[PDB]
Design an enzyme around this catalytic site. Sequence first.
Site, mmCIF file in Angstrom:
data_model
loop_
_atom_site.group_PDB
_atom_site.id
_atom_site.type_symbol
_atom_site.label_atom_id
_atom_site.label_comp_id
_atom_site.label_asym_id
_atom_site.label_seq_id
_atom_site.Cartn_x
_atom_site.Cartn_y
_atom_site.Cartn_z
ATOM 1 N N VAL A 97 16.897 19.442 -4.599
ATOM 2 C CA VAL A 97 17.824 19.044 -3.511
ATOM 3 C C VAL A 97 17.537 17.628 -3.009
ATOM 4 C CG1 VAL A 97 16.583 19.924 -1.444
ATOM 5 C CG2 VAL A 97 19.086 19.900 -1.519
ATOM 6 N N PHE A 112 18.229 24.606 -3.801
ATOM 7 C CA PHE A 112 17.412 25.266 -2.814
ATOM 8 C C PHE A 112 17.154 24.386 -1.589
ATOM 9 C CE2 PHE A 112 16.116 29.339 -4.726
ATOM 10 C CZ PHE A 112 16.661 29.190 -5.974
ATOM 11 N N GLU A 145 7.561 23.751 -13.216
ATOM 12 C CA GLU A 145 7.694 22.705 -14.238
ATOM 13 C C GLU A 145 6.842 22.943 -15.481
ATOM 14 O OE1 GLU A 145 8.698 18.629 -13.274
ATOM 15 O OE2 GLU A 145 6.695 18.074 -13.961
#
Lengths: 290, 291
Positions: B150, B59, B241
């Site tokens: 990323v 992303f 997460e």
Amino acid sequence: VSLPRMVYPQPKVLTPCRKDVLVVTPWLAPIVWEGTFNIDILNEQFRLQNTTIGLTVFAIKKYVAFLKLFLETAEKHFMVGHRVHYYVFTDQLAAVPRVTLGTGRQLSVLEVRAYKRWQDVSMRRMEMISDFCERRFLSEVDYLVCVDVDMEFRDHVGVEILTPLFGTLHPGFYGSSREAFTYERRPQSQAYIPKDEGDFYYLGGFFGGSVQEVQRLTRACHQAMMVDQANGIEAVWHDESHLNKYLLRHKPTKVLSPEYLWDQQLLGWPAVLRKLRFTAVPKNHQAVRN
Amino acid sequence: MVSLPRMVYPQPKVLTPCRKDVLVVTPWLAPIVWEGTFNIDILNEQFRLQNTTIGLTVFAIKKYVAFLKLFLETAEKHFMVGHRVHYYVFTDQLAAVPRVTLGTGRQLSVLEVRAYKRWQDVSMRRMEMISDFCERRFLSEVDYLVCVDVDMEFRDHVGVEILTPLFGTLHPGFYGSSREAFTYERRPQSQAYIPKDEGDFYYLGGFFGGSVQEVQRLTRACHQAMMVDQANGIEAVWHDESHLNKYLLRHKPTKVLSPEYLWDQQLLGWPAVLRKLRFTAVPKNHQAVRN
Ligand SMILES: CCCCCCO[C@@H]1O[C@H](CO)[C@H](O)C[C@H]1O[C@@H]1O[C@@H](C)[C@@H](O)[C@@H](O)[C@@H]1O
Ligand SMILES: CCCCCCO[C@@H]1O[C@H](CO)[C@H](O)C[C@H]1O[C@@H]1O[C@@H](C)[C@@H](O)[C@@H](O)[C@@H]1O
Ligand SMILES: O=c1ccn([C@@H]2O[C@H](COP(=O)(O)OP(=O)(O)O)[C@@H](O)[C@H]2O)c(=O)[nH]1
Ligand SMILES: O=c1ccn([C@@H]2O[C@H](COP(=O)(O)OP(=O)(O)O)[C@@H](O)[C@H]2O)c(=O)[nH]1
Ligand SMILES: [Mn+2]
Ligand SMILES: [Mn+2]
């Protein structure tokens, strides 16, 4: 399907399971030893899919004497709490003893031809298992476990072994190198493995996996033996030799330690074995093979 | 399967473990992938014969498009080299994707997505975006999905040793900790709630995957859990997460990647237990880049 709340000791990352032995293969399959697995989590995992385990076993001629002890010990140690469907292959229907089975467990008896030589009886197991899975398509069971009859269960043998394809380490050769392994060394044989090849020496008397994988393996091994017969060659360790050729070329997704097939008379009880689970019943080979 | 060819390699020893210093298998018999535990030759054979295809999602929302260059260029050197790979770059800026030269049999697709204002929503909404992506083109294009942050760069081998039905990654700053210290969601009112006496591992939201069927299953469930929380007026302490950690606790991963596969060298150094650093964070300024 989601697991419910479970309380158990935490897997400690910087505290190894076992340190004396190899617990994983270089192709990332587990080697099953005591203290590697929490059976509580594994039981729950497999019970949520309502797993059914087939257990095939050949008791031909004088080997029917082994059935009672094999079957009763299976009741006390083999996949208890799970669905179990035994498959007993024999030349004598009447000689199969009446063994009381726990709930959710059943037995079926299937008659087969009795071969003269004990090598053929052991070899043609692959043919008969294959012909039976072909005839049934699969249906009844999710996994098949294929074992020798001349054995008794002494400790837990559960769903930890269940995986698409598995073999077990031969107790004689787990501390031996690959050139000491008793592979078929004649290049004429379909079971030939040269001195530079081989991972483990696997037992012929304990293998299994999913129905698909087991049908695939038994068919491969039988046709491999048929080509050997046509070429006039008999593999040194018969059915076992062709399984080793196969598990070299198609790696098992789990491997079992010699905990899962031992001989206490011949080999004792070394420190690397915390449990003896499945053991050789002492036999006079020459006399019991007639 | 697919019959393996003859191979020559050092023999695995039953009485001689590769790693005595670490857990190399979980309590549910999933391998923990550390350097030493695997022979890449054998694995590269098994998968390549399957003609295995790998999809890598990433992303690049708003200002995080600046990370793409280093990410993709380092992926070409170390990520799944020799296998069929497809990059999926999710961005709000289709003109910000850098022109990166790819090896043979490797593709890149840019998908347009919105940009939520808050960085927490950017991160949390990846689960829905990956899932909507998965549903759009079923398992049409790849055999496995890998889903990564990323703000990263590959520094060493990351290959088919990671591939399985479902995997997760051990968080770098927790791998040694005890379960009570894990920063799970601790409030019973959240779906990601995990009490003090549960938990196996603390996983990363920035590196997970598995088979297409399993990843889509994971991301979808995670998105739904988040919608329920937002309706209840609660946001999990560590966002996607947290929901992931709940999901992997209840659905055990079939492989676990060691901290080797996501590390921060600036924050945590290079401990003796980590023979390699395969995939590491690019040091960033958290307030400014997230805006
Ligand atoms: C030098 C090491 C000796 C270890 C014993 C070998 O056992 C035999 O191994 C061959 C393979 O080469 C074959 O698998 C038969 C096997 O013997 C059977 O199994 C053992 C464990 C004993 O129970 C024997 O009596 C069996 O006949
Ligand atoms: C006591 C543990 C300290 C380790 C650092 C904690 O890192 C952060 O942990 C939370 C959850 O506890 C969440 O995973 C984000 C994470 O921070 C990111 O990842 C680390 C490894 C660094 O690279 C940070 O800069 C990132 O923002
Ligand atoms: O007359 C026989 C010979 C063999 N077997 C089957 O073949 C297996 C292999 O034989 P054996 O156990 O003697 O081989 P070993 O353990 O000696 O390698 C046995 O377990 C039986 O299941 C049988 O049923 N009847
Ligand atoms: O403004 C943002 C915020 C986040 N992200 C994406 O969401 C991931 C997770 O965010 P971040 O790296 O900040 O989390 P951290 O690694 O710091 O825990 C990033 O890698 C990005 O891919 C993004 O593209 N733009
Ligand atoms: Mn036997
Ligand atoms: Mn990040």
